[PDB]
RNA sequence: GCGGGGUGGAGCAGCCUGGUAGCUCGUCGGGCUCAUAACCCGAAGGUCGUCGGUUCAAAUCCGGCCCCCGCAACCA
RNA sequence: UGCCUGGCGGCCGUAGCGCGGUGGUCCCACCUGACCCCAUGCCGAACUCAGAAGUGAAACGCCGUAGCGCCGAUGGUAGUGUGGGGUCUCCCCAUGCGAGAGUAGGGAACUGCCAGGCAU
RNA sequence: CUCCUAAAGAGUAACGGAGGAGCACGAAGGUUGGCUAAUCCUGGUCGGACAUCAGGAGGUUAGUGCAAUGGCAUAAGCCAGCUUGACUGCGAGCGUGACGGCGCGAGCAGGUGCGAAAGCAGGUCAUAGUGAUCCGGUGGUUCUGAAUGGAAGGGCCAUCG
RNA sequence: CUUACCAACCCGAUGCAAACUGCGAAUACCGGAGAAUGUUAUCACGGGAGACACACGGCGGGUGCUAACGUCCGUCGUGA
RNA sequence: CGUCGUAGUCCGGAUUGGAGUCUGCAACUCGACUCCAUGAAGUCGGAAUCGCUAGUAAUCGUGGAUCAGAAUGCCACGGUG
């Protein structure tokens, strides 16, 4: 019938890009699905928010037999 | 549908978890005739100790090389081989096999021999 | 808009209680669960009561 | 295990030369006999399906497996998940002791017997045929009969083609019209 | 009048018409009518040019129509102010870029194909040219 | 521009609340009558304006197109 | 040291699929038996146990093969940052960046740890 | 709330283009173990285009309590066993908002479930399912109690309209 | 039985898409390092505001008729 | 006297298949009858309606005309009643 509705933007996306130094608990990326997967020292929240489980620099890699993007923390 | 590929699927989840935990795992492979045991480094590419029934050093003292009491011999052997090497706490990787019978007899034997898991 | 709000009262002497919802049309049976009672600091059984 | 013993000694070496097999493992085998009883009308009343499965339990001595509707279809007006029919699969010697029980007792009983067809093969070496009456078996007594429901019987063989398939059951003296 | 039998959506954005065309060579017949200009081709213009060519060769040989009006164009009715939602779909167009082959013909002599294409070009809003099949 | 409607031949239900099509008349066969009406007994006829979707399932719910009757078109 | 097999990895199609061939001392697989441990919403099929008569048919491994997938330049083209211009719904010039597709071609994976067998 | 417009970080308007929500669930939650679709072909009692059975093809074209999008094979999909972590107190550190707020969260203490164990569990694949404050109700409460002892009332905690 | 015609799937060839993607830039943005340059140009706290009617031009778009010195956003410039 | 024991039955006989007999030049359309086999509807009949007063109704057989053959019709006869 009639349009005119929308929802508030959710501010998704990457918060800390490759090489950035983060503290433990820092949110790395907010996402709906697991577009990015948790690697080493990275947790996956209930809404699939990837957060650093240790200090260090974030690192993006593509691994596995399905070429999936992983995010890990190079502990430094 | 081979039983092997269906078994690797059963073992993938626990292995990913052990890899994420950075733990040194005790991998067990079971065939109708033999049984095997390996202790892999946390990186998953180095074999620290190993023991199995295809080693004549252990095979000669067994009536049959693929029954339940044969698994207890490998469980006892792999643990004392690892204790003197320096590893004390590991994680048991049943690797798609049900924790029952032979692999269970291998586990508690290694548990009895002083391997904490 | 059918689920009614209920409260689960602890079986212990303390008046502590949880609150939850329940569809009393499909599930007429009383709800009983083991929940942590922070007054006695034990896991006791909680029985249903009216809100 | 009558024909089971008759299998490993007689029908193997005649077949081994009939197809000129290199290994004995190439000869076809018989894995399982599965009896299906599609009730269909149990949605009206389910008291008749249990005694329907009670018959199938007496034909093979195994408690049947009640199959459920895989998906809802209104063409036969059933919703997915309804108890729609029972089945029993037979393996090992219980398959054999049943496999002779029909070929020597199940064959000489069917009304107006004319012989089985040679075209009722899956195309890869597996046979299937349906019996219309259940009073053809010695177990089920005529006195106790609430309905005349039949059932399907399919023969799962390791054969690769129908020629190797028909050759195996022919060795068991199967009626081929 | 050509028109999609069904669509995922009824109305589309205006968009732009930049770039050069794809399908710049005669692929089915032997002669083609290639557009050298840029613009839109309504479904009526396509049908009008087809009838002009179909009658030109007295319904002989084969004719391909390489374009298809898949873009809906909306319009607001008269005496209606701005706003109150997008207008209703009135006709369909095919966006044309320079080099697009519009029609192809086969089974007729070249001198007859030129006159057929010349009669059809007079119905189209864009400048066109005559092309022939070449060895790729 | 907004409301309601389209279903045996005619006039109306059912739709709201998805599964099961009702009524009165008419029509058709048989009776009563010397004969017709009235009246008595029985029977047939709708796949629900269409297309499209939701659903296991659509007259029924939701979109579009045809149609049908309504109400509104105000201040210059 | 070489060959061969098993396990765990790296890597994630140049590594896949098909087609052809091939392997059983060991290994592996099928296999044998099943009262019992255990198991089937029925079935020792699977899972599990006890075994070693048979077989490499299947599966798996290996070898070959360009049928397909896959990889893939060079050049050109599209686009585009900045500056300028035109006939300005679209382009052009200077300069920087520069695809996608396609073409030549490549290509029948590579590799680590441990273990066993065999030759040495 | 979801997608597009939105110009490859975030955000971004219109009486712009399309759809949804004002819930549901003590299992549809937790855990352990297992499992892998759609569709089609062939054969087969009633049985039919479509029921259950068997085989092959196929490879997720299926499924997910519901819109869309992003996800999902280690399945987040399906089944069974045992269960109540749909725990209490907290919380490094971040995300997002003018603010009120909203969101994610390892780890710590107490107590608990499942598992042989490593472990996992502070609801559900994720994102909608909602309403500030005042006033008042109900339960609790080593708080207060207008001379004093009580009480009323108030506070605090839980919760309701 | 053969028969104005329509025709799924598959195969070959050819296009189209804001709400298609087995591809994929230039830019922009985030972070790190390094010089030179810039009257700290940056951040925080405090005192005082004003402003919340914008306009046109370029570029990228929605809307409209790729109509409007129209309208609504993004970004830059100028006017203000 | 025996049997059947309330059932679509040892009720009912339709229909159909096969094999025949006779008349008749000739049983295909289109005869009657026999044997074997099969075994429809039908379980007492809506609205309505018919006959009959005594050897009558009801029921049971028998004969004749027409006629080569072809009666459940017609015309007659008696039994029970």
From Swiss-Prot, chain A:
What InterPro entries has UniProt attached to this entry? Ribosomal_bL27, Ribosomal_bL27_CS
Q: Please, which domain of life does this record's source organism belong to?
A: Bacteria
Do the record's keywords include tRNA-binding? Answer: yes
Alphabetically sorted, this entry's keywords are:
Ribonucleoprotein, Ribosomal protein, RNA-binding, rRNA-binding, tRNA-binding
List, in alphabetical order, the Gene Ontology terms for molecular function in this entry: ribosome binding; rRNA binding; structural constituent of ribosome; tRNA binding
Q: Mind telling me which HAMAP family this protein's record contains?
A: Ribosomal_bL27
Q: What is the protein name stated in its UniProt record?
A: Large ribosomal subunit protein bL27
Lipid biosynthesis as a keyword of this entry, yes or no, is no
**Would you tell me the Gene Ontology cellular component terms?**
cytoplasm; cytosolic large ribosomal subunit
Family named by the database record: Belongs to the bacterial ribosomal protein bL27 family.
Report the record's disulfide bonds: none
* Matching Pfam families: Ribosomal_L27
Query: What interactions and quaternary structure are annotated?
Result: Part of the 50S ribosomal subunit. Cross-links to the 23S rRNA. Cross-links to the A and P site tRNAs.
BP term (GO), one? ribosomal large subunit assembly
Q: What SUPFAM superfamilies has UniProt attached to this entry?
A: Ribosomal L27 protein-like (SSF110324)
PROSITE patterns named in the record: RIBOSOMAL_L27
From Swiss-Prot, chain C:
The keyword Glycoprotein is assigned to this record: no
Q: List the GO terms this entry assigns under cellular component, sorted alphabetically.
A: cytoplasm; cytosol; cytosolic large ribosomal subunit
Q: Which GO terms describe its biological process?
A: cytoplasmic translation; response to antibiotic; ribosomal large subunit assembly
UniProt keywords (A-Z) are: Methylation, Ribonucleoprotein, Ribosomal protein, RNA-binding, tRNA-binding
In terms of InterPro entries, this protein maps to: Ribosomal_bL33, Ribosomal_bL33_CS, Ribosomal_bL33_sf, Ribosomal_zn-bd
Gene Ontology molecular function: any one = tRNA binding
Instruction: Establish whether keyword ATP-binding is in the entry.
Output: no
Q: How would you summarize the oligomeric state and partners of this protein? A: Part of the 50S ribosomal subunit. Cross-links to the P and E site tRNAs.
The UniProt entry, under NCBIfam families, shows: PRK00595.1 (NF001860), rpmG_bact (TIGR01023)
Q: State any further remark.
A: Surface exposed on the 50S subunit.
Its family remark reads:
Belongs to the bacterial ribosomal protein bL33 family.
The protein's name in its UniProt record: Large ribosomal subunit protein bL33
Q: Which gene encodes it?
A: rpmG
Curated annotation (Swiss-Prot), chain D:
Gene Ontology terms, MF aspect: 5S rRNA binding; RNA binding; structural constituent of ribosome; tRNA binding
Query: What's a BP term from Gene Ontology annotated to this protein?
Result: translation
One of its Pfam families is Ribosomal_L5_C
Task: Fetch the InterPro entries from UniProt.
Answer: Ribosomal_uL5, Ribosomal_uL5_bac-type, Ribosomal_uL5_C, Ribosomal_uL5_CS, Ribosomal_uL5_dom_sf, Ribosomal_uL5_N
Q: Which residues carry this modification: N6-acetyllysine?
A: 2
* KW RNA-binding (keyword) present: yes
Q: What GO terms fall under cellular component here? A: cytoplasm; cytosol; cytosolic large ribosomal subunit
PANTHER family given in the database record: 60S RIBOSOMAL PROTEIN L11-RELATED
State what this protein does: This is one of the proteins that bind and probably mediate the attachment of the 5S RNA into the large ribosomal subunit, where it forms part of the central protuberance. Its 5S rRNA binding is significantly enhanced in the presence of L18. In the 70S ribosome in the initiation state was modeled to contact protein S13 of the 30S subunit (bridge B1b), connecting the 2 subunits; the protein-protein contacts between S13 and L5 in B1b change in the model with bound EF-G implicating this bridge in subunit movement. In the two 3.5 A resolved ribosome structures the contacts between L5, S13 and S19 are different, confirming the dynamic nature of this interaction.
Q: What else is known?
A: Identified as a multicopy suppressor of the slow growth phenotype of an rsgA (yjeQ) deletion mutant.
Q: Indicate the family of this protein.
A: Belongs to the universal ribosomal protein uL5 family.
- Protein name, UniProt field: Large ribosomal subunit protein uL5
What organism does this protein naturally occur in? Escherichia coli (strain K12)
From Swiss-Prot, chain E:
Keywords, A to Z? Hydroxylation, Methylation, Ribonucleoprotein, Ribosomal protein, RNA-binding, rRNA-binding, tRNA-binding
Q: Which GO terms describe its biological process?
A: cytoplasmic translation; ribosomal large subunit assembly
Q: According to the UniProt entry, which residues carry N-methylmethionine?
A: 1
One of the Pfam families matching this protein, by short name: Ribosomal_L16
PTM summary: Is hydroxylated on Arg-81 by RoxA. The modification is nearly suppressed when E.coli is grown in anoxia.
InterPro entries cross-referenced by the UniProt entry? Ribosomal_uL16, Ribosomal_uL16_bact-type, Ribosomal_uL16_CS, Ribosomal_uL16_dom, Ribosomal_uL16_sf
A GO cellular component annotated for this chain's UniProt record is: cytosolic large ribosomal subunit
Report the residues modified as (3R)-3-hydroxyarginine: 81
Please provide, alphabetically and separated by semicolons, the GO molecular function terms listed in this UniProt record: rRNA binding; structural constituent of ribosome; tRNA binding
Q: Which SUPFAM superfamilies match?
A: Ribosomal protein L16p/L10e
Family of the protein in this entry: Belongs to the universal ribosomal protein uL16 family.
Q: How does it assemble?
A: Part of the 50S ribosomal subunit. Cross-links to the A and P site tRNAs. Interacts with assembly factor DarP(YjgA).
Its function? Binds directly to 23S ribosomal RNA and is located at the A site of the peptidyltransferase center. It contacts the A and P site tRNAs. One of the last ribosomal proteins to be assembled in the 50S subunit. The simultaneous presence of uL16 and bL36 probably triggers ObgE's GTPase activity and eventual dissociation from the mature 50S ribosmal subunit. It has an essential role in subunit assembly.
Among NCBIfam families, the record links this protein to:
rplP_bact (TIGR01164)
Cross-referenced HAMAP family, in alphabetical order?
Ribosomal_uL16
What is the protein's name according to its record?
Answer: Large ribosomal subunit protein uL16
- Organism field: Escherichia coli (strain K12)
């Amino acid at each position: 019938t009639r349009n005119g509705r929308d929802s508030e933007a959710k501010r998704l996306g990457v918060k800390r890009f490759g090489g950035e130094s983060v503290l433990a608990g820092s949110i790395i990326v907010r996402q709906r699905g697991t577009k990015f997967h948790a690697g080493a020292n990275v947790g996956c929240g209930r809404d699939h928010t990837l957060f650093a489980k240790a200090d260090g620099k974030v690192k993006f890699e593509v691994k596995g037999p399905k070429n999936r993007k992983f995010i890990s923390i190079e502990a430094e | 549908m081979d039983k092997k590929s269906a078994r690797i699927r059963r073992a993938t989840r626990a292995r990913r978890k052990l890899q994420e935990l950075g733990a040194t795992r005790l991998v067990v492979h079971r065939t109708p005739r033999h049984i095997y045991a390996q202790v892999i480094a946390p990186n998953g590419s180095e074999v620290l100790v190993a023991a199995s029934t295809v080693e004549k050093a252990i095979a000669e003292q067994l009536k049959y090389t693929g029954n339940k009491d044969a698994a207890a011999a490998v469980g006892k052997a792999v643990a004392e081989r690892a204790l003197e090497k320096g590893i004390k706490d590991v994680s048991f990787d049943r690797s798609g096999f049900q924790y029952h019978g032979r692999v269970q007899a291998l586990a508690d034997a290694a548990r009895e021999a002083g391997l904490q898991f | 808009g059918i689920r009614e709000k209920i409260k689960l009262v602890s079986s212990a002497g303390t008046g502590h209680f949880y609150t939850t919802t329940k569809n009393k049309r499909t599930k007429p049976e009383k709800l009983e669960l083991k929940k942590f009672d922070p007054v006695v600091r034990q896991h006791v059984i909680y029985k249903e009561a009216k809100i | 295990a009558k024909l089971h013993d008759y299998y490993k000694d007689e029908v193997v070496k005649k077949l081994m030369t009939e197809f000129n097999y290199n290994s004995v493992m190439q000869v076809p085998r018989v894995e399982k006999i599965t009896l299906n009883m599609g009730v269909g009308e149990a949605i009206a009343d389910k008291k008749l399906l249990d005694n329907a499965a009670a018959d199938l339990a007496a034909i093979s001595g195994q408690k049947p497996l009640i199959t459920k509707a895989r998906k809802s279809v209104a063409g036969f007006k059933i919703r997915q998940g309804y108890p729609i029919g029972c089945k029993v699969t037979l393996r090992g010697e219980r398959m054999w002791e049943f496999f002779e029980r029909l070929i020597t007792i199940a064959v000489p009983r069917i009304r107006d017997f004319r012989g089985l067809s040679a075209k009722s093969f899956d195309g890869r070496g597996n046979y299937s045929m349906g019996v219309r009456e259940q009073i053809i078996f010695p177990e089920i007594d005529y006195d106790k009969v609430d309905r005349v429901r039949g059932l399907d019987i399919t023969i799962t063989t390791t054969a690769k083609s129908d020629e190797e398939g028909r050759a195996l059951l022919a060795a068991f003296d199967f009626p081929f019209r | 009048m050509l028109q999609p039998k069904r669509t995922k959506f009824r109305k589309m954005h205006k968009g732009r018409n930049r770039g050069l065309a794809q399908g710049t060579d005669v692929s089915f017949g032997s002669f083609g009518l290639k557009a050298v200009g840029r613009g839109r081709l309504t479904a009526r213009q396509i049908e009008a040019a087809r009838r002009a060519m179909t009658r030109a060769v007295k319904r002989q040989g084969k004719i391909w129509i390489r374009v298809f009006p898949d873009k809906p164009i909306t319009e607001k009715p008269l005496a209606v102010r701005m706003g109150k939602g997008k207008g209703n779909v009135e006709y369909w167009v095919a966006l044309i870029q320079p080099g697009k082959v519009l029609y192809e013909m086969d089974g007729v002599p070249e001198e007859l194909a030129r006159e057929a294409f010349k009669l059809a070009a007079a119905k189209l809003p864009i400048k066109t040219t005559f092309v022939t099949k070449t060895v790729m």
